[PDB]
UniProtKB/Swiss-Prot annotation:
Effect of residue 112 to A: Lowers activity by approximately 30%
Name of the protein: Glutaminyl-peptide cyclotransferase
Substitution effect: residue 126 to A: Reduces activity by about 50%
Positions annotated with a glycan in the UniProt record: 15, 262
Amino acid sequence: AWPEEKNYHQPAILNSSALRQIAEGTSISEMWQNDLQPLLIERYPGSPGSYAARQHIMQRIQRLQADWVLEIDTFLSQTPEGERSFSNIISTLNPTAKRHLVLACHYDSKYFSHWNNRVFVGATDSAVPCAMMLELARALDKKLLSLKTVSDSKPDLSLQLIFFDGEEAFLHWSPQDSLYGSRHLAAKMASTPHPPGARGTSQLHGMDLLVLLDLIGAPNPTFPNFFPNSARWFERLQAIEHELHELGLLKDHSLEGRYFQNYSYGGVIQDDHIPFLRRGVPVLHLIPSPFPEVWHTMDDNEENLDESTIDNLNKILQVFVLEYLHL
Ligand SMILES: [Zn+2]
């Protein structure tokens, strides 16, 4: 019965004053300095930056008041370069709650040989998504702390963050050389009872919706509404964007240049959501089409990021998450 609850779940929509509070509650400059910059480093699996990125992400979550439970999902896999260790970071509020809304991105960076003394740091791909998730945890900390309180008056639902390792191919993208962390974690969750002691249901049944952020940070992104089974949630993002715009709460933003689009997409994008989608998890895939102009080039750097765009998207995402969780 409970695994169907997601199908009927409704947002608790925020009023104008709440929207203004949320818009003012997030700081793009603080995210930039404290959450984003430490990640703008080479961080392919096993590199010093991989370890540093992991420490940084964990550290930033630990300093918060909300009752986050951190779990490092570490495993080995063969790769074109030989065996490597990969570590997914999972951060969960109320780990025994039957349902979670799940926000995710990948924290590894793709390996490139150094080019004119330049290194690939994957600013949009996906350092910015990581930082947006960390800034969301910080900005909403007091609201999220309320989830620590037990009540029959609300659904058994909370929030999880996943930072996937090993999303990127080491060489040429193949089913075997990509998605190392997400293929591993989806298989693990599929085979794990949830809630503990349950018959039938797995941790995948507990995932209300996977909201996967990827390739965010370029100016004027356009996100297609990819999947019918999450289209109603996508439409909430459009509505939040529109209302925030109308309230004067977005920066350098026009209705003509809005981010969340009516149209869908005519191909199939491979990303960390694939192992989840194929097992039936609803996915809201916040990846733009087209990809950023700088995609997989040395120009995917801090210079080419757009502050206002990320700030706007932070506001929209934070409203979405609060409305989903009825906070
Ligand atoms: Zn990439």
